[PDB]
């Protein structure tokens, strides 16, 4: 690359709540503490709940039953 024209780009420490710590090369200048990683984001176990349809007939039959 051309030497001067780019900003700096070096390795940082991204620690997350999921136990995952990633030493990845980035552009923040300091350490980093992630909200969600790729290891804890609720897609691998979320979408089966995340629409939350249920059942109206069972809502009826729950709230009273004859």
């Amino acid at each position: 690359m051309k030497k001067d024209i780019h900003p700096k780009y070096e390795e940082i420490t991204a620690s997350c709540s999921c136990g995952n710590v990633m030493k990845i090369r980035s552009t923040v200048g300091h350490d980093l503490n992630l909200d969600v990683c790729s290891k804890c984001h609720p897609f691998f176990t979320g979408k089966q709940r995340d629409v939350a349809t249920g059942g109206r007939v069972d809502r009826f039959n729950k709230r009273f039953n004859i």
């Binding site: 690359m1 024209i5 780019h6 900003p7 700096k8 780009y9 991204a14 990633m22 990845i24 090369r25 980035s26 552009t27 923040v28 980093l32 992630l34 909200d35 969600v36 990683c37 790729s38 984001h41 897609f43 979408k47 995340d50």
Partner: protein, 177 residues
């Protein structure tokens, strides 16, 4: 580095076996990742282009190319030669490292995330996906941004038909659907 070594380790093996390729060079690579912010009010004022330059410099440590208009249209009232947008091409190791940061940090931060769409595959292999707000990258200081922006990423891979590109990104374990 990690995805490049893992791609030479595991993805090549699995793709060559599961698509029955004769030799070993028939597996689809990835050759470029293109980031693009095509900003609108660059002709209404100039300062948006330097703020977008800072934006793409933060998303990747290159300095972005300020691309201009090809032909002169009038429904957007731009002349021929006005600097419209700003782009970044990433090729090789920088592409790999930014691609790792994206696939393990950034797409966990799309607001109301329900997986990247599957029709978006341009019939050849080359993936393309827009992201609405640029803040989802971990390098954007949310307390420093004043103007909301957003970009699109275009992962040009060298597959022959886009079923192979779908299989390549699914063996990379993209969040698709």
């Amino acid at each position: 580095a990690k995805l490049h070594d893992y791609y030479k380790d595991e993805v090549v093996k699995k793709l060559m076996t599961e698509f029955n390729y004769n030799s070993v060079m028939q597996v689809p690579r990835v050759e470029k990742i293109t980031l693009n912010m095509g900003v609108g009010e660059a002709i209404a004022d100039k300062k948006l282009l330097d703020n977008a330059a800072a934006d793409l410099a933060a998303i990747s440590g290159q300095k972005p190319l300020i691309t201009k208009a090809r032909k002169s249209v009038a429904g957007f009232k731009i002349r021929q030669g006005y600097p419209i947008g700003c782009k970044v091409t990433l090729r090789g190791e920088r592409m790999w490292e930014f691609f790792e940061r994206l696939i393990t940090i950034a797409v966990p931060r799309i607001r109301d995330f329900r997986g990247l769409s599957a029709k978006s595959f341009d019939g050849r292999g080359n993936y393309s996906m827009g992201v609405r707000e640029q803040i989802i990258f971990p390098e954007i200081d949310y307390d420093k941004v004043d103007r909301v922006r957003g970009l699109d990423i275009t992962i040009t891979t060298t597959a022959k038909s886009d079923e192979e590109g779908r299989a390549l990104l699914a063996a990379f374990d993209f969040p698709f659907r």
